[PDB]
Each structure stands twice: as C-alpha cells, then as structure tokens.
C-alpha cells in the first residue's frame, strides 16, 4: 500500500508542474491578445 | 508517513491555487470573447 501511495503522489507532483507550465504559456497568450485588443 | 503527509499537503494547497488561476484566466478569456462577439 505505501508503494501505491508514493507512486500516486509522485504522479501527481509531476502532473501539477506540467499543468502549471501550461497555465503560464497560456497566460502569456491571453496577455498578448489583451495587448492586441487594448492598444491605441 | 511524515513525508507522504507533507507531500499531500503541498499538493492540495497547490491544486487550490491552480484552480484560482484558471478561474481568473477563464474570466479574462470570456471578456475577450465578448469583445470579439459584440454587435
């Protein structure tokens, strides 16, 4: 059981870092669109 | 067990923060979508 818990935890931490990276990439894209729609 | 607990705790805190960021960004995208769809 402890091996299952550990491997689940490990999978989760790896996934969280990737989800964060995807969010950061997309936050730049939205800000780029926002700049395009806000410029003079 | 202390390590597992602390990993789990870090993870739950992180999930709530990732969710909040998504909600903030979902509002931003919806605002853009409205700007592009208006008459």
């Amino acid at each position, epitope marked *: 059981l402890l091996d299952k818990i550990i491997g689940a935890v490990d999978q989760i931490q*790896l996934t969280q*870092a990737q989800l*964060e*990276e995807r969010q950061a990439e997309m936050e730049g894209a939205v800000q780029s669109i926002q700049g395009e729609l806000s410029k003079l | 067990l202390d390590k597992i607990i602390g990993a789990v705790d870090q993870i739950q*805190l992180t999930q709530a*923060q990732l969710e909040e960021r998504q909600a903030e960004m979902e509002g931003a995208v919806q605002s853009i979508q409205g700007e592009l769809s208006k008459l």
Partner: nanobody
C-alpha cells in the same frame, strides 16, 4: 516565514558549468517538491526544473539534458547543476516551492554566460 537564499551564480564562459544552491528554511526539502525558475530581462518567468518529494525529476525542453536538479536533505538545500551553458541561459535564477509562488520570491542568483 519561508526563506530562500539562492547562490552559485556568476559570470561563466559558454560551454562552462555552474552549480546553483538554494538554502531553505521553514519547510523541509525532503517533504516538498521544489522548483527552479529563471527570468531573463523583460521576459516571463520560465520553469526550468522540478524535483518531487520522492526524488523524481523533470526538465524544460530548454534544459535538454544539460541540467541536473538534486538536493541535500540534511543541509535542506536544493541544487541545480548546469553544464554546457549557452548565452541564451543568461537570466536570474530563482528557487521556490509551488505553493508559495503566488506569495514570495527570493532575490535569485544572477547567471551571465558570455562567448
């Protein structure tokens, strides 16, 4: 509070190597996943490397096998070994835990790579 003390940066030649250190207080590095980031001037913060609680690692595509993250549990310190450095790696490098990135950043350590 959590303290983050980055060190090990400097001026290095292309193809050279560095070993960054972050001395941590207030959380245990052998309990928490720990991240290294970098920020070049005027650009967005980029995630560089992560080490999980149980020691798995992953790297940004920009690392491409050159970087190795590790830790010393007794010194509560996270390391980033950087080999075959390139001018494009010039940035301020920061260590953090994911749960605090909305909250606090250390001063970082400046890395400058020249040809």
């Amino acid at each position: 509070q959590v303290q983050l003390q980055e060190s090990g940066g400097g001026l290095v030649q292309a193809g050279g190597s560095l070993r960054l250190s972050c001395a941590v207080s207030g959380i245990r590095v052998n309990v928490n996943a720990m991240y290294w980031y970098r920020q070049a001037p005027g650009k967005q913060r980029e995630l560089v490397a992560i080490i999980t609680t149980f020691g798995s690692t992953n790297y940004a595509d920009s690392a491409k096998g050159r970087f190795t993250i590790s830790r010393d549990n007794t010194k509560n310190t996270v390391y980033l070994q950087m080999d075959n450095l390139k001018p494009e790696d010039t940035a301020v490098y920061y260590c953090n835990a994911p749960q605090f990135t909305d909250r606090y950043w250390g001063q970082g350590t400046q890395v400058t790579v020249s040809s």
